[PDB]
Amino acid sequence: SYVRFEVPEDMQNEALSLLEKVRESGKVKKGTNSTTLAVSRGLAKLVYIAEDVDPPEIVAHLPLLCEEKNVPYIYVKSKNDLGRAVGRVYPGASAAIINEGELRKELGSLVEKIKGLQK
Amino acid sequence: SYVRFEVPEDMQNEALSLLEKVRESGKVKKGTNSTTLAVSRGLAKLVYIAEDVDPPEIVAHLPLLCEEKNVPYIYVKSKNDLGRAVGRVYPGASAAIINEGELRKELGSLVEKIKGLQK
Numbered sequence: 011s012y013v014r015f016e017v018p019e020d021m022q023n024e025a026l027s028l029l030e031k032v033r034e035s036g037k038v039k040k041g042t043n044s045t046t047l048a049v050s051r052g053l054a055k056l057v058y059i060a061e062d063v064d065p066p067e068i069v070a071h072l073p074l075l076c077e078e079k080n081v082p083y084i085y086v087k088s089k090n091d092l093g094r095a096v097g098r099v100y101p102g103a104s105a106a107i108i109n110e111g112e113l114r115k116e117l118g119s120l121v122e123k124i125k126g127l128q129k
Numbered sequence: 130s131y132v133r134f135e136v137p138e139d140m141q142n143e144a145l146s147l148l149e150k151v152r153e154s155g156k157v158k159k160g161t162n163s164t165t166l167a168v169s170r171g172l173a174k175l176v177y178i179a180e181d182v183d184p185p186e187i188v189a190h191l192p193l194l195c196e197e198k199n200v201p202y203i204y205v206k207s208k209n210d211l212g213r214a215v216g217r218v219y220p221g222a223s224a225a226i227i228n229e230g231e232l233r234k235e236l237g238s239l240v241e242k243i244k245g246l247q248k
């Protein structure tokens with residue numbers, strides 16, 4: 011009940027692949043508290059939220075805060091996928107790219123693509 | 130520093146009395162989403178959180194954001210007390226005072242007492 015728009019599956023997978031790549035080059039915040047702080051501080055360039063978080067209430071504030079702070083965010087179906095993308099063998103509920111490192115143009119294009127999605 | 134779950138009962142109850150009175154002459158936010166926006170916007174003068182909300186995860190971001198934005202907040206023992214204070218038929222999770230109207234005295238003294246619990 012926190013999923014506010016449908017993300018095509020190819021963009022989810024494109025977003026998760028970029029997140030894996032940003033780790034070596036840039037900076038990612040992992041977990042809901044750190045993601046929230048990054049959004050609040052205006053440092054979040056792109057926020058990831060898994061659609062199967064347990065309990066869903068822990069991320070319910072995040073889409074609304076991202077919209078308030080004009081921070082792009084994207085849903086991914088699987089918290090297990092999100093955890094692997096941030097480099098972990100356990101699930102991840104949410105994450106934020108803070109510094110894209112050398113992937114500025116790729117992040118740019120993905121953000122534009124997310125912005126174009128019907129909401 | 131702020132031992133938020135040991136706030137004196139009399140302070141909690143002074144706070145609940147103020148919130149119920151402020152509904153009449155001032156402005157309050159009666160839900161978690163609206164409270165969160167008020168905090169993000171720097172408009173919350175005082176945030177209330179019930180200690181027995183189910184699940185606690187629905188308000189877990191509030192202490193984080195309040196400390197981030199220098200917003201006073203206070204946990205109250207009972208979501209039923211909080212809901213009565215804001216006039217809700219169903220238990221409250223959180224609320225905020227935006228404008229205390231004619232209760233300048235009472236908001237000002239309470240906020241100073243809550244700040245006295247810190248550092």
Ligand code: NA
Nearest residue numbers: 018019020021
């Ligand atoms: Na596909």
Ligand code: NA
Nearest residue numbers: 041042102103
């Ligand atoms: Na996590």
Ligand code: NA
Nearest residue numbers: 047048051053
């Ligand atoms: Na940050």
Ligand code: NA
Nearest residue numbers: 166167170172
């Ligand atoms: Na507001």
Ligand code: NA
Nearest residue numbers: 050168169194
């Ligand atoms: Na904020």
